[PDB]
Amino acid sequence: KHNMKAFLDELKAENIKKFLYNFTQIPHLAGTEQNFQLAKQIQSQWKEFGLDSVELAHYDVLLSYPNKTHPNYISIINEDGNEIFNTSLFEPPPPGYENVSDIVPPFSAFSPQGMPEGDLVYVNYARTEDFFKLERDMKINCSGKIVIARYGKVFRGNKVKNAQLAGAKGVILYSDPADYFAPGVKSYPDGWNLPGGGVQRGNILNLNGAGDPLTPGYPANEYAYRRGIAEAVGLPSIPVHPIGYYDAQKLLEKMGGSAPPDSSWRGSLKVPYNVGPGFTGNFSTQKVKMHIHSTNEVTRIYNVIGTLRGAVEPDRYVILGGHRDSWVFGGIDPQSGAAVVHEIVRSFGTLKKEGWRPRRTILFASWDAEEFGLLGSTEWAEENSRLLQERGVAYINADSSIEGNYTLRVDCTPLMYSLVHNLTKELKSPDEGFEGKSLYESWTKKSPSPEFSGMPRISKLGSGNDFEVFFQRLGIASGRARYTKNGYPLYHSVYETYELVEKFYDPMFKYHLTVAQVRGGMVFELANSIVLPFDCRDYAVVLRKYADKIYSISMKHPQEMKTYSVSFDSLFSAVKNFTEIASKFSERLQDFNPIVLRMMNDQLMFLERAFIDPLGLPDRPFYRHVIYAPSSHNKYAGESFPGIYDALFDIESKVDPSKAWGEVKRQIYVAAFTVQAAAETLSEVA
Amino acid sequence: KHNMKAFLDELKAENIKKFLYNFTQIPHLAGTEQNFQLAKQIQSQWKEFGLDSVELAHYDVLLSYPNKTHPNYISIINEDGNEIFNTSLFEPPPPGYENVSDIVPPFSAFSPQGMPEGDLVYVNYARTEDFFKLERDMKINCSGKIVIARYGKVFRGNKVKNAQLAGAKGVILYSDPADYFAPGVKSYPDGWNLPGGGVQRGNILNLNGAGDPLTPGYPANEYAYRRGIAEAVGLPSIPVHPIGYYDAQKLLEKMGGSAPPDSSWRGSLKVPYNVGPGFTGNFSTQKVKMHIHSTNEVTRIYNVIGTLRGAVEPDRYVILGGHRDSWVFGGIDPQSGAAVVHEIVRSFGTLKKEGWRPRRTILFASWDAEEFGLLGSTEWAEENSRLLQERGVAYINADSSIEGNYTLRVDCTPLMYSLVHNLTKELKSPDEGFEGKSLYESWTKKSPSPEFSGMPRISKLGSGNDFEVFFQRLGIASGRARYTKNGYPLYHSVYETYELVEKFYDPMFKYHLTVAQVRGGMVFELANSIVLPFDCRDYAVVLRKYADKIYSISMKHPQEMKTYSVSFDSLFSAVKNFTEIASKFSERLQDFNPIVLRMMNDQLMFLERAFIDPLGLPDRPFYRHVIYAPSSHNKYAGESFPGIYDALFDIESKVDPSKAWGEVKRQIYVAAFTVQAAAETLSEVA
Ligand SMILES: *[C@@H]1O[C@H](CO)[C@@H](O[C@@H]2O[C@H](CO)[C@@H](O[C@@H]3O[C@H](CO)[C@@H](O)[C@H](O[C@H]4O[C@H](CO)[C@@H](O)[C@H](O)[C@@H]4O)[C@@H]3O)[C@H](O)[C@H]2NC(C)=O)[C@H](O)[C@H]1NC(C)=O
Ligand SMILES: *[C@@H]1O[C@H](CO)[C@@H](O[C@@H]2O[C@H](CO)[C@@H](O[C@@H]3O[C@H](CO)[C@@H](O)[C@H](O[C@H]4O[C@H](CO)[C@@H](O)[C@H](O)[C@@H]4O)[C@@H]3O)[C@H](O)[C@H]2NC(C)=O)[C@H](O)[C@H]1NC(C)=O
Ligand SMILES: *[C@@H]1O[C@H](CO)[C@@H](O[C@@H]2O[C@H](CO)[C@@H](O)[C@H](O)[C@H]2NC(C)=O)[C@H](O)[C@H]1NC(C)=O
Ligand SMILES: *[C@@H]1O[C@H](CO)[C@@H](O[C@@H]2O[C@H](CO)[C@@H](O)[C@H](O)[C@H]2NC(C)=O)[C@H](O)[C@H]1NC(C)=O
Ligand SMILES: *[C@@H]1O[C@H](CO)[C@@H](O[C@@H]2O[C@H](CO)[C@@H](O)[C@H](O)[C@H]2NC(C)=O)[C@H](O)[C@H]1NC(C)=O
Ligand SMILES: *[C@@H]1O[C@H](CO)[C@@H](O[C@@H]2O[C@H](CO)[C@@H](O)[C@H](O)[C@H]2NC(C)=O)[C@H](O)[C@H]1NC(C)=O
Ligand SMILES: *[C@@H]1O[C@H](CO)[C@@H](O)[C@H](O)[C@H]1NC(C)=O
Ligand SMILES: *[C@@H]1O[C@H](CO)[C@@H](O)[C@H](O)[C@H]1NC(C)=O
Ligand SMILES: *[C@@H]1O[C@H](CO)[C@@H](O)[C@H](O)[C@H]1NC(C)=O
Ligand SMILES: *[C@@H]1O[C@H](CO)[C@@H](O)[C@H](O)[C@H]1NC(C)=O
Ligand SMILES: *[C@@H]1O[C@H](CO)[C@@H](O)[C@H](O)[C@H]1NC(C)=O
Ligand SMILES: *[C@@H]1O[C@H](CO)[C@@H](O)[C@H](O)[C@H]1NC(C)=O
Ligand SMILES: *[C@@H]1O[C@H](CO)[C@@H](O)[C@H](O)[C@H]1NC(C)=O
Ligand SMILES: *[C@@H]1O[C@H](CO)[C@@H](O)[C@H](O)[C@H]1NC(C)=O
Ligand SMILES: [Ca+2]
Ligand SMILES: [Ca+2]
Ligand SMILES: [Cl-]
Ligand SMILES: [Cl-]
Ligand SMILES: [Zn+2]
Ligand SMILES: [Zn+2]
Ligand SMILES: [Zn+2]
Ligand SMILES: [Zn+2]
């Protein structure tokens, strides 16, 4: 028999291990020779594995690299303009790789060049709320200052955006042991903690879903028009550089001015965590000086796209995708996901060589340039948008498979809640103490739902990974699953190696295997069920929760709601109608002829599509999903009813309340209309 | 047998006559009591005729009406501010209707209120080129002046837009006998010519496809947020009023200043056609004074939507629609079309009562508020956009069936060229001298193709009628067909009556019948063919013609093309690929299983959809079709490759040529990309 069990049993922990070792011996930075080589290898192997076609899709996009003969660094300078302390020019390489070439040193991709000098201000995590505190509570003025912020809590690009709007002239990012050093575990190479010389790389763009900064809306092909750098989308306007906590300690130890407003502002360094500005009396005349010399450069990137043509519905696509490019070795991010994808392609190809084909077409993708702003997935989706929006069933992401070894973590559209619950009930738990018990059982025990008894937590999708164009721009149902902790200390550091994984995370590759079963299990059911495995009633349940929540935010302002006649009645009405119509639809779907079948599967496929507004969100044309958008304060986090949420945010500070509440009302109308219109797609068609 | 012949033979000239008389006895102005009454009648009749459901879809939209106790008029005033001539307060009513109530007097819908006085300037048709002449050649300055323009050549809203940008403070529109009086025919009631007291009503909005000015993008439902009037879309900023040629003669006879630059600037009045500004010496101190008191008012409108559910593909919609609202009696516009729609519904209902159902769902629409900016069709399409873009096969418009009695006039997407050629070959010509010969034969003889021997002319779709949202915003294949002359003199006048039609246009209702056969014939084939009756190869042929044409425009500037490296190579490459892929697709479509069938019909249905750019055209978000857009200089006219055309227009006058030609290059990239992406939808799907 060729069924899901056949597929799942073919998957092997030992192959995932072999592929992970194979993908992590040399750096695979986007735009480099070694990453083009790996692309070609994967293309070759996927062909050998049995896919029908495997092609490279290339694009020429804006990337960013340090200057090899002109290193980035930070200084403390004295009053004679003398550099009395310099930050490190590279991370100490891990054992046995001290002779690897082409390790890119730590930098903030897309930083402009510059050498600003000034006085430091410590901004905690540089969240929206942290800047409100500095300015509004502590009356600290960040204008003309260099801010130093610890990584964590929110996407780094949002930190740099927040810093720019507070008027900073430079940002220094560092990893505080409070956030990146787990108590009682040893630093790398002797455990999984971040050593003091380790540094987190990462881009600091604010693209809001545009993809390549020079070609928003259109693929970066051979004949593309490009914007000039000055009109590019998302580029920061102040220099930015990341450092480790040994270097951070040196910069923070002399901080004067105000003390931290509270304990939530102090990390674990032997330092006062004084907010500044400037150093204490003795050192009052010393300044901080940045030296940033990185360059932005149009560079070719390569996605690998494999097709396994469907037997019955070849014009319906289920996509499994994840990126291949890494900052250095990528032992977790992304190769722990790419190895799982490789083993899934291998299994499917094994069923294929024995004569099986899935019902629908499965597309497999190895995306490039994820680390530089989701560039590879975005440009491909821009090129193929018409095919995807009329044919795309679902997108399953496959970045890092593990970020911990405690339990499963799933983030997906409500349409796939039932699918995941059912699949995880048929999978074995890899967990200690749950031998013989289902993955569903261990997961719900270790990660219980905040809302329901006997159910696991499933989170929203935001952004910050390759599903974002498919879900947030195009409205294709999307999901992701990984193993997680109770992100991880070595994130985007040179220490993210094969050895980290094999020694400290998953020696038996059993958690990798579990993730391959969940991702592959999902793809199989999406590509093979006769009725698509979506449950519209689950969307109805969450829409009421999100309506309750946004109403509760507005109701912090009862006087204004009275004055400006702010009613949520339309939105609750729409949610009620959606609930009724989806109940009826689900009755027909079980009570219901292939055209009825094909017509009906289309209602299911286009339901996520119906939450798309073609006009996008305000000033963010590429975020079009009215229910979910990446948080405007944290790209990684999903926000519900984002348009109304952003209209309400800090509304009490707006100068013209009538206009502000008018906009809240406008956003309620758009949300209610969109929920009703989505509901109406599930009505009888004629 | 229930086949097309059965359908076509059921259609009767005598019923079309009975319905036309029934729909034209009283005025049906949008938003009035009488037009709600007619809506309810049609709803009732369509139910009786046999449709499955017939519902009223209502919306509350911005409309415009004169003040009943404060009439609009124009004066000549002397130096004491004395009004020595006044224009008429109403058109003399036709015989037997001098006692009809609620005839709205001539006005320009959406004119602001005001009483500007100043000196007249005569601007010919107020085209873009006419204003270039005044300013650039004749050095005439329109700023602070009242312009007087003759109707014709272009949409009136574009005249008022052109006038505003030239700095005019008022516009007077009038009908010149050169354009509205055919030599040797008698004025109404004794023939079909415009009498000197007749006046053409019409709105002067510049909505660029937005629909209701207060709710662009979203339906004007009960809970809608509305823009304030000051932020409304499309409203003119200067008073505007139309007059007949008796009143025009009085205003033009005293015109001084410069003479007409040439004979193309003189109409048929016994007047110099002097451009001005101001009157000749003797009358130099007299001025023109407008008195405009109309008000804009949110008002309820009602569309009638009838459904005949498809037997096999109920989730595929073929739409026949046309408007019901008229300026006065609507004897041609629109009731000559609504009567044909009514008889088509009657025939289909006759097949239905005998047990037949079409393969796909047919939706029939009686739109409201067409005369006020396509409001009814637009708000309905905004409300149902998700259903229409995933389910809409085709839209056939049905405004006025006759505007002449000489020959057929068809304007449609290239996808329906073959369908119309084939259908018209099976229909009988109603023409004198072509008895026993096909409609195809008379039409190609009287209206030969400019390009091909033995073929008829088929024009492009632009805007100015209810197909515009479906075609230009949503990308649903659309068509229209009518009888035309070798528009018509009584257009939008009180003289457009049943008697006009029955006496002077179509006494036997044979031309109406021919149009009912062509519109109904098209709907039948779209709703009933097993393979949709579209030919992609016809699009390939026109794309090359339009690429040749836009290249030829650019090549008026060879030096700039050299300097700025302006290449059309990408666009011709895309057109070549489209031609090859469409050739291959058409081989498969004839060589090819219902899923193959359903999958294949989807490639055909979504081909028009693929020419949609979700980002729209520059500053015109609701015009999204990259091949066709309404001309920026004439809403009624279709423009090909509008984005590149507008980038090139008057480019030699642009101050920064580098930026200007950069934009031409950008538009070429967008067009080439869109043509390739459309081509790729016809490739094999996997
Ligand atoms: C959820 O689904 C329900 C249908 O199951 C849907 O109900 C609709 O609600 C609207 C109100 O938003 C109703 O609109 C009314 O329609 C009648 C004609 O049928 C009009 O006469 C009404 O207008 C009068 O009353 C208004 C209110 O005071 C006045 O403002 C106005 O001036 C008029 O005097 C009004 O337009 C509609 O009939 C129902 N449809 C039904 C019950 O079938 C509801 O809207 C859905 N929710 C959402 C968010 O879409
Ligand atoms: C019409 O359809 C044809 C396919 O039938 C399609 O042809 C494609 O054209 C592009 C050019 O726009 C080709 O792109 C090349 O791809 C190769 C890899 O296969 C690259 O090596 C090339 O890059 C080099 O050369 C460039 C030109 O000098 C340099 O700019 C660059 O730096 C590199 O040195 C280049 O990207 C593509 O391979 C073909 N595909 C084929 C033949 O299958 C054509 O683009 C279609 N038209 C449109 C408008 O889409
Ligand atoms: C990763 O595995 C690949 C595939 O097995 C290895 O590439 C092959 O290497 C052999 C011997 O060098 C060549 O003859 C083949 O042509 C390669 N196959 C390909 C690229 O498809 C590769 O060497 C491995 N990499 C590491 C670091 O172990
Ligand atoms: C998850 O599994 C449940 C339980 O098997 C499925 O729900 C059942 O579906 C069958 C087939 O329609 C029905 O006859 C049962 O009444 C359902 N049981 C319930 C609702 O308790 C459910 O469809 C599965 N989810 C998927 C496939 O997405
Ligand atoms: C247009 O025709 C309609 C339908 O025949 C006429 O409306 C009917 O009039 C009769 C007699 O007055 C009523 O009893 C019916 O209820 C009406 N039917 C409807 C509205 O469906 C209408 O009178 C005609 N109008 C004119 C001007 O001749
Ligand atoms: C218009 O009629 C022509 C001639 O009948 C149709 O073209 C023929 O289609 C049949 C069925 O596929 C083919 O076998 C012939 O080879 C075609 N004849 C040609 C191309 O000369 C054409 O399909 C009709 N157009 C429609 C239905 O849209
Ligand atoms: C790297 O540094 C210096 C200039 O500061 C020089 O070698 C070269 O121009 C730089 N490379 C760049 C700007 O890409
Ligand atoms: C920091 O580096 C600069 C540039 O190479 C150098 O001049 C300075 O001496 C260094 N300072 C220290 C403390 O090593
Ligand atoms: C913040 O402080 C700087 C000090 O240079 C000042 O120039 C800037 O205007 C201040 N911002 C305001 C207006 O509070
Ligand atoms: C893996 O699980 C065990 C048990 O808690 C633990 O010793 C180890 O720290 C975990 N690894 C990581 C990286 O969390
Ligand atoms: C009509 O005219 C006068 C005011 O000029 C008065 O009867 C009434 O306000 C007007 N109606 C309007 C403004 O709708
Ligand atoms: C024009 O109408 C105005 C306002 O009613 C009136 O005062 C004037 O006398 C009229 N002029 C003529 C020429 O009738
Ligand atoms: C056109 O003429 C008017 C006369 O009042 C003048 O005010 C206006 O500025 C002129 N436009 C220009 C700048 O040519
Ligand atoms: C209808 O056709 C005849 C023949 O040319 C002609 O006498 C009459 O003017 C035509 N009617 C119209 C309105 O063009
Ligand atoms: Ca792009
Ligand atoms: Ca609207
Ligand atoms: Cl993931
Ligand atoms: Cl029409
Ligand atoms: Zn990653
Ligand atoms: Zn990463
Ligand atoms: Zn009309
Ligand atoms: Zn009209």
CSV table of C-alpha atoms and ligand atoms in Angstrom, one decimal, chain B residues 415-423 425-426 525 529 531-535 537-538 586 589-591, ligand 6:
chain,number,residue,atom,x,y,z
B,415,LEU,CA,-10.6,36.5,-26.1
B,416,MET,CA,-14.2,36.8,-27.5
B,417,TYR,CA,-13.3,37.8,-31.2
B,418,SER,CA,-13.8,34.2,-32.5
B,419,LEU,CA,-17.0,33.8,-30.5
B,420,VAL,CA,-18.5,37.0,-32.0
B,421,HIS,CA,-17.3,36.1,-35.6
B,422,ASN,CA,-18.9,32.7,-35.3
B,423,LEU,CA,-22.1,33.8,-33.8
B,425,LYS,CA,-22.2,34.2,-39.2
B,426,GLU,CA,-25.2,32.2,-37.9
B,525,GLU,CA,-22.4,30.2,-25.7
B,529,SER,CA,-20.2,25.6,-24.2
B,531,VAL,CA,-15.0,24.4,-23.5
B,532,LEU,CA,-15.2,28.1,-22.8
B,533,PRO,CA,-15.4,29.9,-26.2
B,534,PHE,CA,-12.3,32.0,-25.8
B,535,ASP,CA,-9.3,32.0,-28.2
B,537,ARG,CA,-4.2,33.2,-29.9
B,538,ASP,CA,-6.3,36.3,-30.7
B,586,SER,CA,-4.6,25.8,-28.3
B,589,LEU,CA,-7.2,22.3,-25.9
B,590,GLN,CA,-8.2,20.6,-29.1
B,591,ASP,CA,-6.1,17.4,-28.5
C,6,LIG,C1,-15.3,29.4,-34.6
C,6,LIG,O1,-15.6,28.4,-35.6
C,6,LIG,C2,-14.4,27.8,-36.1
C,6,LIG,C3,-14.7,27.0,-37.3
C,6,LIG,O2,-15.7,26.0,-37.0
C,6,LIG,C4,-13.8,27.0,-34.9
C,6,LIG,O3,-12.6,26.4,-35.3
C,6,LIG,C5,-12.7,25.0,-35.4
C,6,LIG,O4,-12.8,24.3,-34.2
C,6,LIG,C6,-12.9,22.9,-34.4
C,6,LIG,C7,-13.2,22.3,-33.0
C,6,LIG,O5,-12.0,22.4,-32.3
C,6,LIG,C8,-11.6,22.4,-35.0
C,6,LIG,O6,-11.5,21.0,-35.2
C,6,LIG,C9,-11.3,23.1,-36.3
C,6,LIG,O7,-10.0,22.8,-36.8
C,6,LIG,C10,-11.4,24.7,-36.1
C,6,LIG,N1,-11.4,25.4,-37.4
C,6,LIG,C11,-10.5,26.3,-37.7
C,6,LIG,C12,-9.6,26.8,-36.7
C,6,LIG,O8,-10.5,26.8,-38.8
C,6,LIG,C13,-13.6,27.9,-33.7
C,6,LIG,O9,-13.2,27.1,-32.5
C,6,LIG,C14,-14.9,28.6,-33.3
C,6,LIG,N2,-14.6,29.6,-32.2
C,6,LIG,C15,-15.1,29.5,-31.0
C,6,LIG,C16,-16.0,28.3,-30.7
C,6,LIG,O10,-14.7,30.3,-30.0
